[PDB]
């Protein structure tokens, strides 16, 4: 029994219908009882995943009313009926008909939202850091849609390179947005070296790179 | 129903990840469960590794790919069940779940309806390091409306995952603790910020609880504006 899904992933804006498809590679039918052993799970990152549909149709306690499950034994489909923006997850469907259980690969969940600019922030290294020997620039990207963003950082006009690192949020539960970190991250020394260090954000939600800066050592 | 999992941590190649759940709301010999441990890796995806069940006695079984290298067993005295997996090698890196099946009288299988909250176990040589907390202040460069962005900066710490909570709990709208970034020494580290109304500076007080469980590291840091000592003429 090897569980497919299709598709892979989805993005649809609030309010809309979502069907989410799984197949399992033989009958999870069982002749005696005429129940489909098949379960859905939503699972939010960092979360355990969640029950929402058992014996293919029956819905768990407490979960909303615009999850469904429906199926045929091999085919089986998982409704959302009008989405959410805390459905953003991953969705598995799962045989419990035969040794071993098995999980189907999941589908991920996306709302398609306005386009919103973020809100971009910088904040110097701490004075506790840079007695360490290390300072840390962080450039945050707040609150925006769609995900993709792209950041660079100049330090006193110069274009930096391969000594960044960033990483971007999982889609926010309540307003379906992203959010990003940059870190940029030279020795005290280096550091102490400039004056400007700028983080210059591209967004679609930005008529022009917005650029967020600071004079190290000035206030 | 309650499942509750021993902590992160990091176990040594060749050696024996050991975890608990420990179950509140129900027994662990309850005629109707039967107590499940799944992992769930990067690309082999949620993955079922064995159960154990008590019908008349005790029973065990596991999946093929940890035959023989598996225990799952029951603690009537603690209400608990552990899991130990032999011999583990890096590629053994995953979060481990707990959960319970449901069965009933004529039914012999049931869907997982109660989970553990996962415990992600780090294979490697690499002794733990616990991450220095840096504040991320609050200023003229993080404002925008009547809004103030603050955070805390967690860096150089191993294994993964380091915990971040505000005020012990009771601050979570508007926080972000983004996903751990890998830098080029082997170490992690990540920022958690959060916005709060840039009125209230004065009179709220943010602290940014972090805990490290795999090295028994915790830091609380209070995050505020940052004294001004600069500029020097004017």
């Known amino acids: 029994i090897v569980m497919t899904q299709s598709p892979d992933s989805l993005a649809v804006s609030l309010g809309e219908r979502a069907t989410i498809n799984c197949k399992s590679s033989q009958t999870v039918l069982y002749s005696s009882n005429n129940k489909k052993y098949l379960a859905w799970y939503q699972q939010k990152p960092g979360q355990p995943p969640n029950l929402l549909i058992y014996?293919?149709?029956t819905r768990e306690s407490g979960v909303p009313d615009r999850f469904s499950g429906s199926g045929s034994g091999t085919d089986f489909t998982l409704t959302i009926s009008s989405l959410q923006a805390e459905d953003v997850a991953v969705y598995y469907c799962?045989?419990?008909?035969?040794?071993?259980?098995?999980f189907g690969p999941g589908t991920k969940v996306e709302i398609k939202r306005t386009v919103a600019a973020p809100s971009v922030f910088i904040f110097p290294p701490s004075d506790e850091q840079l007695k360490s020997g290390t300072a840390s620039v962080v450039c945050l990207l707040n609150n925006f849609y769609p995900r993709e963003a792209k950041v660079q950082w100049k330090v006193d006009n110069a274009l930096q390179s391969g000594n960044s690192q960033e990483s971007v949020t999982e889609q926010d539960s309540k307003d379906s947005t992203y959010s990003l970190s940059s870190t940029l991250t030279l020795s005290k020394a280096d550091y102490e070296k400039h004056k400007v260090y700028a983080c210059e954000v591209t967004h679609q939600g930005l008529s022009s790179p917005v650029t967020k800066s600071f004079n190290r050592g000035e206030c | 129903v309650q499942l509750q999992q021993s902590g992160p941590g990091l176990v040594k190649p060749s050696q024996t990840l050991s975890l608990t759940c420990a179950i509140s709301?129900?027994?662990?010999?309850?005629?109707?469960?039967?107590w499940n441990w799944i992992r769930q890796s990067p690309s082999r995806g949620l993955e079922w590794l064995g159960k154990?069940?008590?019908?008349?006695?005790?029973?065990?079984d596991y999946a093929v790919s940890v035959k023989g290298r598996i225990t799952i067993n029951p603690d009537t005295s603690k209400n608990q069940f552990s899991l130990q997996l032999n011999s583990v090698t890096p590629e053994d890196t995953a979060v481990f779940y707990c959960?319970?099946?449901?069965?009933?009288?004529?039914?012999?299988?049931?869907?997982?309806?109660?989970w553990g909250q996962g415990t992600l176990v780090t294979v490697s040589s690499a002794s733990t390091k616990g991450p220095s907390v840096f504040p991320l202040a609050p200023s003229s460069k993080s404002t925008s409306g009547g809004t103030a962005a603050l955070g805390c900066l967690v860096k150089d710490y191993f294994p993964e995952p380091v915990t971040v909570s505000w005020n012990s709990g009771a601050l979570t709208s508007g926080v972000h603790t983004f996903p751990a970034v890998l830098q080029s020494s082997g170490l992690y580290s990540l920022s958690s910020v959060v916005t709060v109304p840039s009125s209230s500076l004065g009179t709220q007080t943010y602290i940014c609880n972090v805990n490290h469980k795999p090295s028994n590291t915790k830091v609380d840091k209070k995050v505020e504006p940052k004294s001004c000592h600069h500029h020097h003429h004017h």
């Open positions: 014996w293919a149709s």
């Open positions: 154990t069940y008590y019908r008349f006695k005790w029973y065990s």
């Open positions: 799962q045989q419990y008909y035969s040794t071993p259980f098995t």
């Open positions: 709301g129900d027994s662990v010999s309850s005629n109707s469960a039967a």
């Open positions: 959960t319970r099946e449901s069965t009933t009288y004529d039914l012999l299988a049931g869907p997982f309806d109660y």
